Design a protein around this ligand. Structure first.
Ligand code: HEM
Ligand SMILES: N[C@@H](Cc1c[nH]c2ccccc12)C(=O)O
Length: 403
């Protein structure tokens, strides 16, 4: 019976992942209704294997809410079948092109400057007499919300509507454990994000800051020719979910912990710009926030000596792949001098590689620039405590001393 379904692995899964990558690199996890895939080689190729489809909302819903299917007209199916995350090419590619205006080279030139300032301002807000901080609520949870506002264009005044709704929706992705929130409630909040997205663009909600992702997307709508208004609304809903997911906080907090525990890496960062430049990727490699991602077999495939039949579900363990010693020597070392950290799988790979990958790496880079030049002596001030979630894994508490 798979140790991947044991809640006790979440604080430190890596010894279990390493053992299973060796002995059981592909194996069945009953609680996921899926084949777990543990090695870098199999995860990276699986992400780019056209025999594995991203059209998986049916299968994954059946895994998470067995006995509770939904019809094709239900918001769950209309959303999944009309967003980049859960579509294959060619539709995927039309949907991705339709959001290009938010993510151009010029746009990221602007976001680089916004994020530098946002992170600067966050860290500068920590009072002089503060030696202790819980880096989760104070910093890791906070930076992504300030980025959502200033770089993405989510109105600040609408955060009270969005934050709790995304937190509810995100319980869908609770890993191999009982669902804490009913399907009915999740679908209601998913519906609510669609209403909000459409009303935001109509000017019925908050004010979107200029030159942000959402402002750019809004201005692009008149020129779209291969997608529909409903598709834009579906895609915004996904964007809201991704913006307020625990992914970015977990990356910030797990990287902060890594620095706290590895002071010579602080020294490296302050000594060598190449180590700065590699910080986002080494942090992303060191702990994938999304530890596994889902696929379905569109055709029979063979992986890890297992024949996976068309229609079966797979869980590609990005978090295990990132610490596979065959790809990353001494994979449990947090090492800014590592030469291949950019090979991590935390943003996936290929067709569905994270749309926000550059935005998030800029956010991480500027955070650590600000934090570590202010407070190079960061250390633990108690036990870091993890959320009870393997799928989207993150710290709930990170007590630190700043000096
Ligand atoms: C550290 C933070 C984040 C991490 C670790 C993360 C991780 C991922 C991963 C693993 C995928 C690929 C999943 C798969 O193929 O199965 C993905 C895709 C995606 N990401 Fe992120 N992501 C983050 C932040 C964000 C944010 C803030 C947004 C907001 C826009 C976002 C938007 C997306 C979208 C739209 C896709 C789908 C792209 C496609 O299907 O073409 N990501 N991300
Ligand atoms: N892993 C998710 C896809 C995903 C990646 N990043 C996310 C952020 C938020 C929500 C979902 C996602 C899935 O297989 O369904």
């Amino acid at each position: 019976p798979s140790p991947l379904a044991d809640p006790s692995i979440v604080p430190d899964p890596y010894p279990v992942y390493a053992d299973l990558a060796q002995r059981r690199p592909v194996h069945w996890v009953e609680r996921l209704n899926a084949w777990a895939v543990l090695t870098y080689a199999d995860c990276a190729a699986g992400l780019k294997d056209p025999r594995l489809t991203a059209d998986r909302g049916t299968e994954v819903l059946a895994a998470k809410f067995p006995g509770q299917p939904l019809p094709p007209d239900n918001i769950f199916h209309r959303w999944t079948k009309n967003v980049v995350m859960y579509t294959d090419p060619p539709l995927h590619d039309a949907l991705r092109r339709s959001v290009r205006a938010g993510f151009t080279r010029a746009a990221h030139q602007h976001y680089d400057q916004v994020l530098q300032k946002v992170a600067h301002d966050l860290v500068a807000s920590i009072p002089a007499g503060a030696t202790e901080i819980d880096a989760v609520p104070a910093l890791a949870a906070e930076l992504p919300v300030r980025s959502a506002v200033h770089a993405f264009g989510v109105p600040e005044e609408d955060l009270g509507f969005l934050i709790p709704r995304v937190n509810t929706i995100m319980t869908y992705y609770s890993g191999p454990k009982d669902q804490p929130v009913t399907q009915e409630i999740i679908l209601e909040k998913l519906t609510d994000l669609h209403t909000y997205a459409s009303e935001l663009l109509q000017g019925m909600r908050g004010k979107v800051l200029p030159d942000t992702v959402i402002a750019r997307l809004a201005a692009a709508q008149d020129g779209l020719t291969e997608t529909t208004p409903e598709q834009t609304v579906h895609q915004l809903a996904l964007v809201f979910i991704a913006l307020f997911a625990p992914t970015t906080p977990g990356s910030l907090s797990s990287g902060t912990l890594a620095f706290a525990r590895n002071p010579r890496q602080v020294e490296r960062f302050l000594a060598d710009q190449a180590c700065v430049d590699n910080t986002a990727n080494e942090v992303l490699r060191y702990n994938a926030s999304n530890q596994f991602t889902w696929r379905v077999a569109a055709k029979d495939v063979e992986m890890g000596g297992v024949r996976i039949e068309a229609g079966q579900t797979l869980a590609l363990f990005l978090g295990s792949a990132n610490r596979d010693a065959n790809m990353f020597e001494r994979p449990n070392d947090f090492d800014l001098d590592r030469p291949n950290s950019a090979r991590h799988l935390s943003f996936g790979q290929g067709v569905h590689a994270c749309l926000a990958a550059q935005l998030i790496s800029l956010q991480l880079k500027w955070f650590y620039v600000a934090l570590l030049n202010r407070f190079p002596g960061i250390r633990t001030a108690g036990e870091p405590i993890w959320n009870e979630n393997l799928e989207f894994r993150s710290l709930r508490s990170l007590p630190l001393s700043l000096r």
